[PDB]
């Protein structure tokens with residue numbers, strides 16, 4: 201009972217799994233070998249003499265970034281075929297990942313996910329982590345959704361995307377892999393959390409005050425997002441929320457399932473002890489329209505739903521007071537078909553302290569998974585890049601060369617066009 | 629009358645003698661820079 205399976209694909213998937221499974225290891229007390237010196241059931245198992253194997257698949261067509269966990273300390277933690285690798289990288293090619301070289305590794309991925317689901321006595325969700333900006337994260341990741349939605353139909357599939365940033369790309373064919381991979385995260389995904397790298401850069405710049413953060417520091421905060429997300433699945437609290445209730449009291453009409461993340465007790469030790477990080481101040485920094493983890497301003501969008509996950513020494517009287525002061529402000533606005541728009545959930549477990557990383561010791565936390573119509577702009581910015589490139593048929597010989605017909609470019613743009621059209625239609 | 633004795637030595641007989649061989653003994657001795665020891669000290673042990 202109470203198991204969730206994380207499914208990492210793409211190189212950013214392995215690295216985000218190195219931080220997330222790290223945090224799950226501390227948050228139940230597992231040593232680096234896999235031994236505690238049953239809250240752990242969602243993430244780890246019990247293999248006899250205290251062994252604790254994680255419930256993950258690390259999936260990549262390029263062996264290099266999955267080899268560093270196979271050669272570091274945690275070959276002995278992860279089961280050695282739960283780290284499925286390949287030979288050639290998909291190489292920023294959605295065609296290569298989805299049609300050509302992803303169709304030989306997809307057998308080992310589905311076989312291992314099946315074995316990781318047979319030892320479950322009631323499974324809540326599939327927390328798939330990926331990055332839609334490249335090759336195997338856009339390709340094989342999409343195909344894995346096609347196979348998962350047909351063998352596990354009733355199963356909910358959460359998905360933490362890493363959607364392309366506006367001015368920062370680190371890839372020039374990235375607009376092609378983003379637009380062409382919308383259909384996996386529109387019809388075969390029940391929760392689509394949209395993250396991008398720049399918003400984590402800004403949070404690290406002004407809140408944590410690391411001026412020059414690395415991707416490993418970006419994986420700090422996204423690890424804190426899933427810990428507060430699966431907080432009620434593992435430790436007791438005043439109000440509990442499971443992944444069935446995230447996708448019920450937050451998700452409107454079924455195509456609109458695109459949510460945004462905002463953790464906000466982000467602070468480091470030079471600031472931390474000078475201020476009261478109580479319930480009122482951490483939730484005002486949560487609704488602040490510069491701490492969104494999307495580079496997507498909510499001040500031109502309407503909040504359709506919000507999910508506050510307070511986590512620590514938080515009293516429910518202060519939660520109901522904090523939702524009052526955020527409801528009385530005009531800069532925060534809601535759709536008319538929403539008298540109640542908050543699913544508050546409290547976990548008694550304090551936020552896990554970060555020795556040697558970037559955060560500090562805080563007694564309470566908050567994370568928002570909020571669906572708004574502001575998210576109709578993270579795809580409009582990528583429309584302009586797609587239409588500019590596909591006007592001159594740029595970069596499309598690489599796609600058509602492995603068996604990706606030129607047709608799919610047009611109705612992937614058209615599918616995102618109906619996605620945009622669906623978003624201002626709700627906000628009328 | 630005497631005989632004027634033939635003094636004469638051609639180009640091919642005069643103007644080269646065996647030179648000393650060039651003194652060459654010098655390899656490119658390169659001191660290897662030692663491999664800079666690696667701590668991009670990883671995630672698990674780094675923060676938790």
Ligand SMILES: Nc1nc2c(ncn2[C@@H]2O[C@H](COP(=O)(O)OP(=O)(O)OP(=O)(O)O)[C@@H](O)[C@H]2O)c(=O)[nH]1
Pocket residue numbers: 209210211212215216262289290291292293331332333334335336337338362369370371397415416418419
């Ligand atoms: N959050 C986060 N993003 C990353 C990390 N590493 C790379 N990225 C992002 O991933 C995006 C592109 O995906 P890739 O890094 O190429 O990984 P991929 O999906 O496997 O693509 P291929 O390697 O070409 O198959 C870039 O925009 C990066 O910003 C990381 O460690 N953390």
Ligand SMILES: [Mg+2]
Pocket residue numbers: 210211260261262289290291334335336337
């Ligand atoms: Mg890759």
